[PDB]
Structure 1
């Protein structure tokens, strides 16, 4: 018997699933608590949906619990059994009262009704509501593909909500989509249709977050980020939440403590607003998976606003602060999951007692090519395509990971002819944002759109070129898609691309284990998805 079963991220054991201990570090019991949190949440999804159907209101506070639950179960997000158990209790209470409000409490699934307050009971319930619970291969593949897509969506929705932006149609769809993954009467065609609709709402979440980020901190602009370090003690902030960064910087003003970014917080450097704080140093390190090394050589406090957090080493566990839905037993947690005021004076005091950062690289990188910035260079990018200056755009956005086969992406980018342009977003950029690919007619051969949620800009840019060149099919543009994925956020980006009609997508370093043969077949026949081989072989085939 398996102590657990999880295959939501690309590093899943044998690309089949984790049964004893997650490669990520997630323990059997933590994964069980996560399986219960999802079940009762979907259960809460059905209740909130029935209420809206009866014409009744559902306070937004409910939409926040749902998103918080989902996000907390994303890879490298929360490993704290105490916070998961309590969130399971919170969800049981919440759904128990919303359901009291219904008029016709009929047909409510088990997930909607079941409840427990004792951790031991939650672990038993989990043992029968996890993945395996769905027998039929094709319907399981689709139910979990949507659920993961819904995890990524929720995360983007929460960051938009943290900035005060939220749409009722988004929260309503999410909650209804979750309720449908428990419906035994949905055909496979229904689930395929729901997979595409999810992708659609995927585009909405990213568009909602794009607006929230840009509206509060300005449109990203061409920026030069220093990757070297200073001499003052500092705090390294990681993740994707920009709100926490505004508070951290306002509060670190005048204390002598500098602020650095890590992994997916690099893009914050691209915003005009944050450029007004003198103590906002550079971006330290690379993708998340090198944090055991980089968090250590940074010497100062490390703030994790979201995933990806790798189980800490004792050498720096004491200076690791989590916040929002992030969590690790033994690591100090700063309360706040809705952009409310956060008190970072403890982490700022802690930094004054730490050695300044130990430099590991010097120089700088260019970035800030989001939709608003590239559209302003449109005519210039278009004259380059027309003249043959830029023979091909290569989208390599996505998420990075530990797999050493990912050296592929570094060789791919390194081997591309010098008349091509790489478009990136997401921490997958680290595999090649530190090389020297030069430029084409003054346009960098690596255009960083931003975070993974900024794949949205790459999408906008493409639709724009299709309009300009008056093409009927977006796929007729000189764009090759060589995307890398890791967790559920990369999975909602993919479904967004599929809903937008983008085809010929190459996914790697491997294809999701939760994609069953027949389901994988449809992706191949309808959107022509493919995997990768050698960088030299694909540099020939892909073109």
Structure 2
């Protein structure tokens, strides 16, 4: 008997499932608490959906509980059992109160009705409500594909909410879709439909977050980002939340403490508002998975605004600070998941007692090619395609990870002919954004649109090109998709692209373990999804 079962990320054991301990470090009781939390969140979703159908209000506090719950269970987000158990209690309390408001309680699921306050009872329940609770391979596969897409959607929705933007249709959809994943009456056809609908609301969530980010901090613009370091004490901010950065920059003004970004905070440099803080230094290091080395050499405190946090080495654990829904037992936490004032005074004081960062590399990288910036360059991009200067774009967006096989993405990028342009977003970029790939007529051969959510900009750009060229099908553009995935945000990006009609996506370095043979067949037959082989073979075959 397995102590746990989790298969939601690319690194799952054997591309089958983590059954003893997660490759990410997630322990079985942590995994169990997350399974219980997801179950009661789906129950809450049913109750909220039923209230809306009865014409009754559902407060936005409930929406926030749902998004925080989903995000807390995303890969590398929260390993803190005390926090996870308390989210289970809060969810049980909330859904019991909401159910009291229903006129008709008929048909409420066990997830809607079940509750526990004792951790032991949560762990026992978890054992019978995990992935394996669904017997049927295709229904199971689609339920979990949808659930994972919803987690990614919720993450993006939550960042938009932190910045003051929320849409009732989006929160209502997430809650309804969660509930549908426990409805045994839905057919495989119903669940394939729901998968595509999930992709559509993925686009909606990304659009909302794009509007929130750009509306608050300006549209990204071309930017040179220093990757070397200064000589002052610093704080390294990681994850994705731009509001946390704004507060940190404001509070470090005049202190003598510099602020550096890491992994998915790199794109903050591209926003005009952040360029007005003189102590906002560069981007330090590479993608999340190198952090045991890079957080050590940074020397100063590190703030995780979201995933990915890897279980920290004892050498720097005392200077790791979590915030939002991030957690790790024994790491200091700065409270807040709604963009409210956060007091960074302790992290600033801590930074002053640490050495300045140890430099890993020097120079700069260029980015800021999000939708406004690229549409401003559209005529020139179009002219370069028409003249043959740009023969192909390769979308290499997505999420990086530890696997040795990901050398493929570096080698593929290096081996591309010099008449191609790489479009990127998300930490997948680190496999090739430190190479020297040049330019085509002044256009850099790597165009970084931003965070994984800024894959939205890549879709907007592709749709603009489709319009200008007068094409009937987006797939007739000279674009190859060679996307790397790791966790559930990458999953929603993939579903979003499928909902937009993008075919021929090459996904890697492996295909998700949660795709059953029949579900994978639908994706191949209707969307021509494929995987990777060697970089040299694919450099021939993909073109």
TM-score, normalised via structure 2 length: 1.00
Equivalent-residue separation in structure 1 for 2:379 and 2:390 (angstroms)? 13
Corresponding position of 2:82: 82
Task: Tell me how far apart the structure 1 counterparts of residues 413 and 324 of structure 2 sit (CA, whole Å).
Answer: 35
Mapped partners of 2:374, 2:443: distance in 1? 11
Query: How far is 1:498 from its partner?
Result: 0.1
Unaligned runs of 5+ in 1: none
- Tell me the distance in 2 between the aligned counterparts of 1:49 and 1:110: 15
CA distance, structure 2, for counterparts of residue 268 and residue 138 of structure 1: 40
SS of residue in 2 equivalent to 1:314: coil
Secondary structure in 1 matching 2:447: strand
Equivalent in the alignment of 1:416: 416
Question: What TM-score, normalized to structure 1?
Answer: 1.00
Distance, in Å, in 2 between the alignment partners of 1:435 and 1:85 is 44
Report the equivalent of 1:447. Answer: 447
Pairwise CA distance, 1:11? 0.1
Structure 1 residues 36-63: Cα deviation after superposition (integer angstroms, max 9, x where no partner): 0000000000000000000000000000
Q: Deviations over 1:438-474 (max 9, x none)?
A: 0000000000000000000000000000000000000
TM-superposition CA deviations, 1:124-167 (whole Å, max 9, x none): 00000000000000000000000000000000000000000000
The CA deviation at 1:71 is 0.1
> What is the deviation of 1:257?
0.2
d(CA) in 2 for partners of 1:86, 1:174: 22
Q: What CA deviation, in whole Å up to 9, does each residue of 1:189-242 have, x standing for no partner?
A: 000000000000000000000000000000000000000000000000000000
In the TM superposition, what is the alpha-carbon distance from 1:396 to its structure 2 partner? Answer: 0.2
Displacement, 1:114?
0.2
List per-residue Cα deviations over 1:15-43 (Å, max 9, x = no partner).
00000000000000000000000000000
Instruction: Give the corresponding residue for 2:182.
Output: 182
Runs of 4+ residues deviating >6 angstroms: none
Determine helix, strand or coil for the equivalent of 1:95.
helix
Q: Distance in 2 between matches of 1:247 and 1:202?
A: 28
RMSD: 0.2
Distance 1:34 1:366 in 2: 39
* Residues 325-360 of structure 1 deviation map (CA, whole Å, 9 limit, x = unaligned): 000000000000000000000000000000000000
1:501 counterpart SS class: coil
Q: Distance in 2 between matches of 1:118 and 1:530?
A: 45
Counterpart in the other structure of 2:64: 64
- Per-residue CA shift, 1:490-533, capped at 9, x if unaligned? 00000000000000000000000000000000000000000000
Q: Secondary structure at the match of 1:531?
A: coil
SS of equivalent residue, structure 1 residue 23: coil
Distance apart, 1:373 and its partner CA: 0.1
What are the ranges of 5 or more consecutive residues in structure 2 without an aligned counterpart?
A: none
Structure 1 equivalent of residue 31 of structure 2? 31
Q: 1:103, CA displacement in angstroms?
A: 0.1
Q: Secondary structure at the match of 1:49?
A: helix
Deviation, 1:88, is 0.1
Q: State the number of aligned residues.
A: 543
Partner of 2:339: 339
Residue 311 of structure 1, CA deviation:
0.2
Q: How far off its partner does 1:475 sit?
A: 0.1
Name the CA distance, whole Å, in 1 between partners of 2:72 and 2:383.
46
3-state DSSP of counterpart to 1:318: helix
Q: Deviations over 1:44-94 (max 9, x none)?
A: 000000000000000000000000000000000000000000000000000
SS in 2 for 1:315: coil
CA distance in 2, matches of 1:138, 1:198: 17
SS of 2:315's partner is helix
